[PDB]
Design a protein around this ligand. Structure first.
Ligand SMILES: N[C@@H](Cc1c[nH]c[nH+]1)C(=O)O
Ligand SMILES: N[C@@H](Cc1c[nH]c[nH+]1)C(=O)O
Ligand code: NI
Length: 465
């Protein structure tokens, strides 16, 4: 009827908003701010805000908003939500250097100790979505949000059931129910869509695009976006030296990968950030050189008789990562590296054991809100939430720390390009491709979001015709 079936990769454990962006993606939760279809920060739950000085953020909330349990969205509710999320998530905590919050009625005041220009931006982060901390349910299973669809049931790591929240503040949502099921294999997601088991899928494997495009019952939406695929190194393993990272960097054939593995739905990467961003000064493009790699590995004493052994992790959720892994393995052998590929079902959990991997295929949304600061803080600082390999360089730290209190946007761009230049010399990770998000749906599904931030999907206008 008006029921939507969605199939996603990257199964969750907790679906608390501070653990995963899935609640924002599927329409259950909303952040104070958002980015619009053109990537600009906008007020969402906020009616007005002011910044009377560089340590004060005054927010007035809209007065017509309720949580899905009927409770009013007030400043005290936003205060308790933000404080809980900071307390429970390192990602949130490190993105929000908030020193204190006061609340009365619909107005809250957020204070910092010093200037943090990216505060408002990070309040648009989906991990900062607002939920009812007083709700009498487990926030890890059925958080209560302000979004158009309330989570009614959660089968852990498998299925999310949502129902229309009729009093949703923007208007009456257009679906009755939504069912979200996790499926890590991209080919399976496509088969599910083709057999109408599901109506809407993300992360379509590039080699299935043509098959879906030929189907008049289906439609494919591609978006160039700001997601980057990479080879992430484990810097806590002493064998993963600069020579080894440089060697592996030169075993990658980025242009070949973009042309043949992504079949043109990607561009070769240099820095974390898509080169279509005008102010980014990219480092030189690394071209595959097996002899150079072989040479570098001689610096650490590796030979055909005594090769470097690398345990490389991968996962199915982003369909092209394991295809890249396969050709890295084949090519690395020519450079006296024996790569063992291990595909895992729960990548975030697996990487927590730093003794269990040397490198990993990975993918990250490196600039979801128009600023490079988020990535540097989460990926290049010790204990940042996506710094799985524990990359840290005090010289890079210093620039990131300076960036964090830099207000002038032109100066931000300059410091950012300095960080890119300096960090690139370490080869903290090998960035492989800026690749398109590809979404496919039954032709009767209308008005879902496929926009460059790669976060949003469902809103109150998404429907079935
Ligand atoms: N950050 C990786 C792994 C992940 C699992 N869940 C969320 N992320 C990716 O998005 O592909
Ligand atoms: N899956 C999203 C969000 C995330 C946070 N941590 C890991 N992933 C990304 O990779 O950008
Ligand atoms: Ni991720």
């Amino acid at each position: 009827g008006k029921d939507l079936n969605i199939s996603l990769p990257l199964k969750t454990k907790s679906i608390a908003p501070y653990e995963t962006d899935v609640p924002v993606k599927i329409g259950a939760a909303e952040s104070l701010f958002k980015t619009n279809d053109q990537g600009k920060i906008e007020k969402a739950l906020v009616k007005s805000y002011h910044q009377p000085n560089d340590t004060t953020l005054d927010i007035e909330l809209k007065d017509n908003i309720k949580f899905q349990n009927g409770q009013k969205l007030t400043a005290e509710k936003v205060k308790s939500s933000l404080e809980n999320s900071m307390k429970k998530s390192d990602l949130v905590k490190y993105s929000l250097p908030i020193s204190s919050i006061t609340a009365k009625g619909q107005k809250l005041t957020i204070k910092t100790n010093s200037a943090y220009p990216e505060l408002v931006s990070e309040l648009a982060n989906p991990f900062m979505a607002i939920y009812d901390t007083d709700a009498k349910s487990d926030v890890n299973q059925t958080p209560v949000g302000t979004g158009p669809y309330q989570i009614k049931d959660y089968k852990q790591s498998r299925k999310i059931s949502l129902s229309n929240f009729k009093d949703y503040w923007q208007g009456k949502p257009k679906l009755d129910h939504i069912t979200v099921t996790y499926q890590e294999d991209g080919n399976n997601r496509v088969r599910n869509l083709e057999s109408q088991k599901d109506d809407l899928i993300t992360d379509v494997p590039v080699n299935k695009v043509q098959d879906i495009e030929n189907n008049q019952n289906l439609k494919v939406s591609k978006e160039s976006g700001f997601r980057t695929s990479l080879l992430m190194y484990n810097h806590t393993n002493k064998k993963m030296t600069k020579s080894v990272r440089e060697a592996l960097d030169h075993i990658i054939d980025r242009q070949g990968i973009a042309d043949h593995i992504y079949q043109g739905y990607a561009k070769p990467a240099t820095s974390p950030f898509n080169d279509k961003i005008p102010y980014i000064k990219e480092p030189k493009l690394t071209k595959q050189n097996i002899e150079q790699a072989k040479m570098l590995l001689a610096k650490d004493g590796y030979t055909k008789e005594h090769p470097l052994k690398i345990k490389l992790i991968t996962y199915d959720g982003r369909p092209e990562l394991s295809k890249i892994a396969q050709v890295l393995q084949s090519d690395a052998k020519k450079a006296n590296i024996e790569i063992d590929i291990k595909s895992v079902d729960d990548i975030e959990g697996y990487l927590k054991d730093r003794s269990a991997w040397d490198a990993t295929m990975y993918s990250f949304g490196t600039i979801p809100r128009g600023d490079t600061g988020y990535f540097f803080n989460q990926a290049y600082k010790k204990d940042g939430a996506i710094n799985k390999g524990d990359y840290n360089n005090s010289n890079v730290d210093d620039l990131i720390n300076q960036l964090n209190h830099t207000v002038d946007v032109k100066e931000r761009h300059n410091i950012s390009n300095d960080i890119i230049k300096l960090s690139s010399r370490d080869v903290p990770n090998s960035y492989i491709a800026y690749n398109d998000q590809i979404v496919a749906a039954n032709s009767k599904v209308k008005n879902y979001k496929v926009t460059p931030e790669g976060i949003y999907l469902i809103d109150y206008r998404t429907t079935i015709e």
